Amino acid sequence: GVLYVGSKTKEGVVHGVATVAEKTKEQVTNVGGAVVTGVTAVAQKTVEGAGSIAAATGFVKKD
């Protein structure tokens, strides 16, 4: 196929993943996997075949 992306912008401002926590006890923050951010953000064919992208968090605290 053919993928054409043409962006003609002026004064662009982009925020991606933003997390804020305050006055807690246990803080776990897992970010990633295929995070793509930007004024022109293009993601194509992130997973092909039997691959995997697992941004997982196994919180247990098995008291």
Next chain:
Amino acid sequence: GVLYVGSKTKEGVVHGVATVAEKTKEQVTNVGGAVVTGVTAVAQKTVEGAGSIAAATGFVKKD
């Protein structure tokens, strides 16, 4: 196929994933997998074949 994206913008502002928590006990934040953010954001064929993208959170606390 043919995918054409043409964006002609001025003064664009984009926020993606924003999380806010306050005065808790246990905080778990899992973000990702295929997060795409931007003034021109294009995602094509994120998963092909038997692949997988599992942004999972296995909170247990099995007391």
Next chain:
Amino acid sequence: GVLYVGSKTKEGVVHGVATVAEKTKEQVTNVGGAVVTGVTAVAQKTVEGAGSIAAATGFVKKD
């Protein structure tokens, strides 16, 4: 096929996923999978074949 997206905007402002929690005990926040955000946001063929995108949260707390 042919997918044509033409956007001619001025002063665009986009918020994606925004979560707010306050004065709780256990906070779990799972975001992602195929989150796409932006002034021009295009997602095509997110899953093809036997693939899967499972943004799941297995809260248990089996006391």
Next chain:
Amino acid sequence: GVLYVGSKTKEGVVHGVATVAEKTKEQVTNVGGAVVTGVTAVAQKTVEGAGSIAAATGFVKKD
């Protein structure tokens, strides 16, 4: 006295004196004197005392 002018505008467009003539024989154009133009235009005490502002045109053609 006290003269307070507060203007809070967005995307203002101002045209002042515009003259158009076509297919004539004799063209005389006199503009001025106290012409004031702009998004915020303030004129105060243009003439004080025995002064004068005479934007005059003495066309004669005394054949």
Next chain:
Amino acid sequence: GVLYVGSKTKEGVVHGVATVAEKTKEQVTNVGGAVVTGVTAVAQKTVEGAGSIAAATGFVKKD
């Protein structure tokens, strides 16, 4: 006295004196005197005393 001018604008466009003539024989164009143009245009006390501002055009053509 006190003259306060406060202008808070965005994307201002100002044209002042614009003259257009076409297919004539004699063209006379006199502009000036106290022409003031701009996004924020302020004129104060243009003439004080016995002064004068005469943007005059003495077309004669006394054949």
Next chain:
Amino acid sequence: GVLYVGSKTKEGVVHGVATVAEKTKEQVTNVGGAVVTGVTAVAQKTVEGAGSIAAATGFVKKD
């Protein structure tokens, strides 16, 4: 007195005196005197006393 001019602009465009003539025989263009142009244009006390500002054009053509 006190003259305060405060201008807070973004993307300002200002044209002053613009003259256009085409297909004539005699062209006379006199511009000036107190022409003031700009995004923030301030003119104060242009004439004081017995002074004068005469942007005049004495076209005669006394055949």
